[PDB]
Subunit: 115 residues, 4 copies
Amino acid sequence: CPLMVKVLDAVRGSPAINVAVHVFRKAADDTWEPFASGKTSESGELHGLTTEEQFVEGIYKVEIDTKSYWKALGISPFHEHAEVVFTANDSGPRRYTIAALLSPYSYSTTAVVTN
Amino acid sequence: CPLMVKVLDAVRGSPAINVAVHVFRKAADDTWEPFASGKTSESGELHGLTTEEQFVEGIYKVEIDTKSYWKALGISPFHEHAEVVFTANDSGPRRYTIAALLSPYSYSTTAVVT
Amino acid sequence: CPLMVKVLDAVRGSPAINVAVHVFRKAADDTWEPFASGKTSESGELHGLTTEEQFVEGIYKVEIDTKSYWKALGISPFHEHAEVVFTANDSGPRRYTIAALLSPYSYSTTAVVTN
Amino acid sequence: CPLMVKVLDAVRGSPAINVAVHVFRKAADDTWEPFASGKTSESGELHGLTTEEQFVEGIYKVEIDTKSYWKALGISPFHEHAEVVFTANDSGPRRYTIAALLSPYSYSTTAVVT
Ligand SMILES: Oc1ccc(/C=C/c2cc(O)cc(O)c2)cc1
């Protein structure tokens, strides 16, 4: 489990459940190719997106479908989605936890990188 | 205007208007004595809280009544209020802008010292 | 484990380890009396602060000694500390996770409340 | 000034100066076409990116080159950049202020629509 995504709801004070997450990897031609996807669980977490073998060095984009999340709650959000673009494993395999705290007109994201 | 407070609403995407703000200064006996207070304007800002002469070195506490703000919007907030406690150093010309971004169960605050 | 504190470092992308945390409860005379204290572990978490029996309704203040944390890293922080003041269990026992993301001149805190 | 960008530094407690900002608009073919660009000023702000006439309804992407900002400070950041993607509705008079608070491994962004 080298890549983990945690999504929290700042309005309800709870995990953001069933949020669609799409992960892409930048290909040689500067194109974003689908890498993995899933939905957050009851704990607002998404595990098992990839393996150490498949998660090679590269530029990755974690796209969180925040818009659909808020719409389902009857709130008109500002953002189309939240994106986190980062270079991974450039100096060896690391464990990445990408966390996002969501509000209708704002979001905060942080990363926790472990060995 | 050595001290300025800016409050934003992360739910409505607007300035947090009419939010009560109380500023205290720590006294010699470790007690918090009232220093200044006001309410944010239409731009979610609060100016003229103090002057350079009165704003001396010390420990200050900026208390933002976030609870009343959310209650007025029909939302039950988590926090009683948001507090920002800092030491106003006074080492060279400095203006302090305390900004706070509010959500019902969360708040973020930052300081811009220029 | 009705009260949990999680502290993260936004500068290093890691858990904030060994951060002193003091919890107070507002007494009848509007005074803050010591309730519990501890230091965050390697995971940036602090468990076992109290029990369901002892964690009664009331106003609590979680004080995070952020200043000492940054000083130890050779960084002069803005805040003396970070405080989170909230009413707990006013409508029955709840589980509270208080999270704080720290930066030298900024901090973000959120709460996750469970049944 | 229908669109304004404000960038702050959470590590130094100051405006994020000289940060490159690129704005794109989604074209009919789902492609991102350059719309405007600039660099934040001493106040960490970027004004005059567009006009009311040119800023029509559509999906816009504000890209903040955070990586270059941190590298210049001798800090290795986590993100390649920070992006803010939103639909500019155009329902009544509206000004958009996109604010971003930057940290090496974290960033927070909010929108103030007044
Ligand atoms: O502004 C904010 C941005 C991010 C966060 C993250 C919190 C968090 C808490 C956990 O227990 C586990 C985790 O992986 C992440 C909190 C506030």
